[PDB]
Amino acid sequence: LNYGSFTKEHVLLTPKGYREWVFIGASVTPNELNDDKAAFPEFHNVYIDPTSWGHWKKTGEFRDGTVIVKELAGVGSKASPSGNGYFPGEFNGIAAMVKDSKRYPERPGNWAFFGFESYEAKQGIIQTDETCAACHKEHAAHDMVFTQFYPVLRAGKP
Amino acid sequence: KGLNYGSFTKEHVLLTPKGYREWVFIGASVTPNELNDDKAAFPEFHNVYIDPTSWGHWKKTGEFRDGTVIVKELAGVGSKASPSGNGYFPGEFNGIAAMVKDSKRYPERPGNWAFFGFESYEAKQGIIQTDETCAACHKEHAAHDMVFTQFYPVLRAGKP
């Protein structure tokens, strides 16, 4: 069962329930370490849809129909009873990518990258390749996904 | 109703949980060794999960039910710079800690929570901790029922 919902023009409707998908890793790019303006502020919590997680465990590959959501959250504090560091605050928005060789035959890896203006937007905005795909293609460890930062994926593959 | 998550010995000790990466993630924080005198208490990234049945009850009530299992998975800092910018990026898994709320198994523990450490991922079972080792700090500073929900935006957004 596919977890994306799409328009006739193959655009990703804003995913619902992705926090109940399979978490694959979190990173943090604080504003204060990125000239007071991180590209994706600031914590990133990343999810893969459950069907594609199942296929990943079987094959170590992203199936046609894979949806990955990167959820952004602010840095809420830098010190807690557990020590110094970064601790999350409030949610900021999402980014997403969808793999589909039928809908996206001309895109690298058959991935479409979606930006979201806000959580109330009805749909994502598909991006031209220089804005997202170029960086992922140049630097991601596996099939345009930064699996070097997803220890769940690396431990879960066969 | 949902399944009960976690498995327990006859002495009510949590057996080392399996499949928790398919539970509901509730938030991640990072205490890097380099910001904690080269030795964070829990090195270093923490990815936290609540079992799915207790997540369902949380969405309905904003409370942790009897049978709640929360797992905090530790991972290293793998790096501090990537194409997305400077910060902290995870490395390899380090270990787990857990807490279980159960008024029947742990009637005399603060909040009916049992705190478990794990010697390694290969250990058969956790080691239940004394109150001063874990519960004291959680009770003193956690925002809700001994859980640090100030750092779990998924929980705060999911409660009614």
Ligand code: HEC
């Ligand atoms: C995180 C991301 C994800 C998660 C899947 C993944 O491959 O990591 C999505 C869906 C996404 N981005 Fe990309 N991005 C970059 C890196 C290094 C990471 C992982 C580490 C971290 O969380 O900080 C990402 C890198 C880059 C990049 C390098 C210069 C660019 C220009 C972009 N990303 C751009 C975009 C998008 C353009 C709008 C977009 C929709 C993204 N990323 C989606």
Ligand code: HEC
């Ligand atoms: C994270 C933790 C979790 C996850 C649930 C939670 O309430 O956040 C577990 C299951 C657990 N710890 Fe505790 N802990 C502290 C803090 C602030 C955080 C959240 C922020 C972060 O991830 O860094 C925790 C704090 C403290 C603490 C304060 C001085 C003490 C001494 C301990 N924790 C101790 C313990 C454990 C004793 C061995 C134990 C099993 C823990 N924590 C479990």
